[PDB]
Amino acid sequence: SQRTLLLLSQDNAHYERLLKAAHLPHLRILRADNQSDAEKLIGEAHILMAEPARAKPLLAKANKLSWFQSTYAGVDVLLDARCRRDYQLTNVRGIFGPLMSEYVFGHLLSLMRQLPLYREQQKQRLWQSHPYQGLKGRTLLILGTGSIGQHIAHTGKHFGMKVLGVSRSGRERAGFDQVYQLPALNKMLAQADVIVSVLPATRETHHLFTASRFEHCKPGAILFNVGRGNAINEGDLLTALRTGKLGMAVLDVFEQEPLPADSPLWGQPNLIITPHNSAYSFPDDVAQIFVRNYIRFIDGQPLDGKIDFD
Numbered sequence: 001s002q003r004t005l006l007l008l009s010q011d012n013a014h015y016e017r018l019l020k021a022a023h024l025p026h027l028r029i030l031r032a033d034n035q036s037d038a039e040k041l042i043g044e045a046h047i048l049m050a051e052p053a054r055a056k057p058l059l060a061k062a063n064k065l066s067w068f069q070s071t072y073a074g075v076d077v078l079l080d081a082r083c084r085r086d087y088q089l090t091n092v093r094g095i096f097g098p099l100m101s102e103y104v105f106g107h108l109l110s111l112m113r114q115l116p117l118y119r120e121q122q123k124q125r126l127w128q129s130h131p132y133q134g135l136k137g138r139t140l141l142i143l144g145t146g147s148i149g150q151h152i153a154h155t156g157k158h159f160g161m162k163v164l165g166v167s168r169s170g171r172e173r174a175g176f177d178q179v180y181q182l183p184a185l186n187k188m189l190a191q192a193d194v195i196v197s198v199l200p201a202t203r204e205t206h207h208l209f210t211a212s213r214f215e216h217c218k219p220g221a222i223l224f225n226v227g228r229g230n231a232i233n234e235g236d237l238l239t240a241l242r243t244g245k246l247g248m249a250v251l252d253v254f255e256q257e258p259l260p261a262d263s264p265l266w267g268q269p270n271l272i273i274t275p276h277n278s279a280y281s282f283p284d285d286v287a288q289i290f291v292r293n294y295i296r297f298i299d300g301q302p303l304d305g306k307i308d309f310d
Contacts, residue, residue, distance in 0.1 A: 001028030003298075008038050008050035008058070009071050014283040015049060022291050047297075049290055052077045059083055067297055069290050071281050074228075075307055076201075088297075090305040092281050092289055097151025099279035104152050104196055104224055105159070107250045107272065108135075111222060136160040139191050143208070144198035144227065145173045148279075152196055164188055189217040194224070201228040211236035212245075220247040226278045229255040234265060241270050252278040 005027055007015050012031050019029055030045070032038035035057065042048070042058045048068040052075050055068065062068075062084075070078075070091045078089060110116070113132055121128060140156035142149045145167045153175030156163045165173060166188060168181030180188055182204070189195065199205045208214065209223070209232040223246055225232055234255055240246045250272045251265075257276055265271055293303050 002026035003046040004028045004030060004044050004064075005047040005049065006038070006041055006045035007031045008042075008048060008054045010051065010054075011071065011283045011286075015287060018283060018287040019290070022287070024291070024294060027294075047294075049286075056080075056083070062087070067293075067303070069293060071283075071286050073281070078307075079309065085309045088303055089307040089309070090289075090293060090303050091307060092286055093305050094147050095281075095285045095289070096279040097147050100148050100198070100226060101151050101155040103226070103252070103274075103278040105155055107224070108194060108222065111248055111250075111272075134160075137162070138193040139164065140194050140196065141166065141188050141192035142176070142196045142198065143231075144196075144200075145169060145171070145176065145179060146198075148198050148226075149173070149196075150175045152198075156194075161194075164192070186214070186217065189214070189221075192218060192221055194222050196224045197227050197231045199227040199231050201230040206230055207233045209233065209237060212240070215240035215245040218246070219244055222248045222250065224250045224252075226252045229253045229257070234263075238264060238268060238271075241268055248272070250274070252276055 003026060005019070007029065009015055012033055016029060016031050030041050032041055035054070038058050039061070042061050043063055045062060046064050046066050048055060048062065048065055049071060050068065051071050056077050065087045067088045067090070070089065073092050073096070075089060075091050112135065114130060117130065137160060139162040140153070141164050142152055143166045145165045149165060150173055153163045153165065157175060163175060163177050165176035165179040166182065166185055167179050170179065170181055172179050197209070199208065207230070211233050215236060232251070237249060241249055248270045252274045253276055259265060259273065265273060289305065293305070296303055
């Protein structure tokens with residue numbers, strides 16, 4: 001049917017429904033729900049929509065492939081020097097702001113209002129209130145000023161927080177009271193009640209939250225990492241949490257995922273772990289990205305979310 005799209009996603013059923021509703025002419029839509037079925041089909045696909053980990057073992061067979069739309073923001077497994085680069089790769093961007101605000105502030109208010117304590121008191125039929133504080137006037141520091149950083153910024157300002165951003169990059173962006181740059185980090189950390197790391201993994205962001213020097217910043221601070229495991233040296237985050245250098249940590253991402261059942265991280269009382277699910281790629285929004293990119297693609301125009309292999 002002119003070009004062929006292959007769907008290789010855990011959300012295939014949803015994608016197939018959505019894409020069949022979109023009525024795209026001259027496009028045959030094929031689906032493979034396991035790797036075995038995909039083996040037979042991938043050589044026929046001009047377009048692929050898939051999770052990177054599912055496509056990766058099939059990619060050497062993808063000899064008609066022109067454009068691969070990843071359903072995930074993260075595509076690092078496809079930058080492997082062993083993998084082909086003779087196609088256009090796009091990822092998913094710009095749709096995770098609200099979901100990240102929900103995750104960050106759900107976890108933050110859970111902590112601030114001590115919900116788990118109240119749940120445990122309820123199990124023992126104990127009526128007892130404890131002190132807490134509001135968010136009014138507290139300082140939110142966000143590392144990363146893109147659409148994700150900005151949305152979390154507007155939410156903090158909504159909750160009456162001061163909002164400082166870190167970037168260089170540099171630019172003042174919407175939702176931030178002030179935006180500073182890496183040199184100002186320690187000065188900014190010192191006044192941070194809540195810290196949200198949403199950084200791309202650069203050599204300069206490798207182990208930002210370094211062993212100790214850095215962790216020397218505030219008894220009751222809550223640190224979120226929702227960017228990449230790389231921002232944090234885990235061994236030294238641990239000691240920070242064990243010795244009152246940091247109040248709490250909420251981590252959605254890790255140096256190794258799934259986090260090995262071995263990890264000392266699991267057991268640390270003031271560490272909260274989520275299985276890399278702070279902001280899911282919802283098919284309704286990803287399909288919209290796909291169809292807009294499809295229109296550009298068949299016209300020969302530049303794709304959005306395009307990944308530079310170099």
